């Protein structure tokens, strides 16, 4: 079977995901694009304070660099 963590990211295409960065900040938006570096493009992205549902800021369509990602919640829509 060919399943590996990277292609699991492709299944999240056009779904709401949560991205947490190395500084602990959390960003929620719809995953529009991703590449093999885990560079992401998120649509209608809102930053939330860590571990909470408190919106901090809206940033629109964001390109997130993969090297500073801690993790991506790929099923986040089904859980919000």
């Amino acid at each position: 079977k060919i399943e590996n963590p990277l292609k699991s990211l492709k299944t999240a295409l056009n779904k709401i995901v949560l991205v947490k960065l190395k500084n602990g900040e959390e960003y929620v938006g719809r995953l529009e694009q991703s590449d093999g570096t885990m560079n992401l493009v998120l649509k209608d992205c809102t930053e939330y304070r860590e571990g909470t549902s408190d919106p901090v800021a809206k940033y629109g369509r964001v390109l997130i660099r993969g090297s500073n990602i801690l993790f991506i919640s790929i099923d986040y829509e089904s859980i919000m």
Copy 2:
């Protein structure tokens, strides 16, 4: 033949604890892993470091291996 990374495959479908560089602890069932130690965990709960106090639920998570400190590969068997 045995090496640290093959030990990671023995934890597939088992509950593991992953500690990241910032000290926070994530507990979940190991679904997938690769050679760089990127992981996919199912039903992932973040705990406050050193405790069993849950702080957040994140569902199915892709964790980047570069930020991992260690993985408790038999965590199921010690709780």
Copy 3:
């Protein structure tokens, strides 16, 4: 053909917001970019993270891609 880096090219000559590793935010018109996400911004203002409180003005800046957290590539159409 769509991918993250090409989406950056769509923001050329538009105002973007760039957040760096230390959390600081910089807003200015994207004049140039390369494959490593080095950017040149014009009329760049730094803002306190998460606000519209101006902190400093830096003129035309060359931002090193390796220390960028993210780029809001549609910032002009929402600010």
Copy 4:
């Protein structure tokens, strides 16, 4: 003749070691495997507060990533 730091890690196999990571936390356990990048597997691993013998948490069998290791006390067994 052939003596180098990474070979000295081979003589600690199945001995108790102390591993200190980049955030100053110390982990004690029996070294079961190591590779060339200093990835480690420890059995019966206990975290202790830095500089002390106050145990903080028990983690069982752990795979430690080499890149965040500060040092390994390779003769810890014979001293603690």
Copy 5:
């Protein structure tokens, strides 16, 4: 037709620039040299407290390592 970020660093040669480093500190001086990795030589370099005009220390002629640079204000002279 050839416009790239690093080429614009070459336009600032012999001009006063502001370099902000990863720790937030700001260094002002005349750019004398740069290379492809963004290593720089500044002449008559003064550090300023971040976002102010309070000088904190003088360092003279400095070789700055590119990997810790956040940004360079390549036209800082025109705006003082």
Copy 6:
């Protein structure tokens, strides 16, 4: 006639050295082995409070990962 920084590390073999790690802590011991990546083996390693002489912990024979070293005092024995 050939002199470079890594070769100067070999001159400290069998001498007491001080190693400062990137979290600021200092470790003093007799350098027994080293390699091209500045991985080190120290014998009789004592950690000291940064910048002081107050011992903090003993760790015996330690393998130090070169990538997390700030500097090595290669003549410390002659000035301690």
Copy 7:
């Protein structure tokens, strides 16, 4: 031929100040350097950042180039 790394070579046998990523400053006579900016300083004294307060003496030190923020290659003219 002039470039930033060759400018380090000109500092040989000169007193330099080396600032590391954690902000600590180290002053000594530059004895050796290489292409990665690994340095050997003679008679090295560490100073509290931005001040003249000596904190510790370290003799002959080998500094790893990867943790260096900057090197004042002419520092005796500044002391």
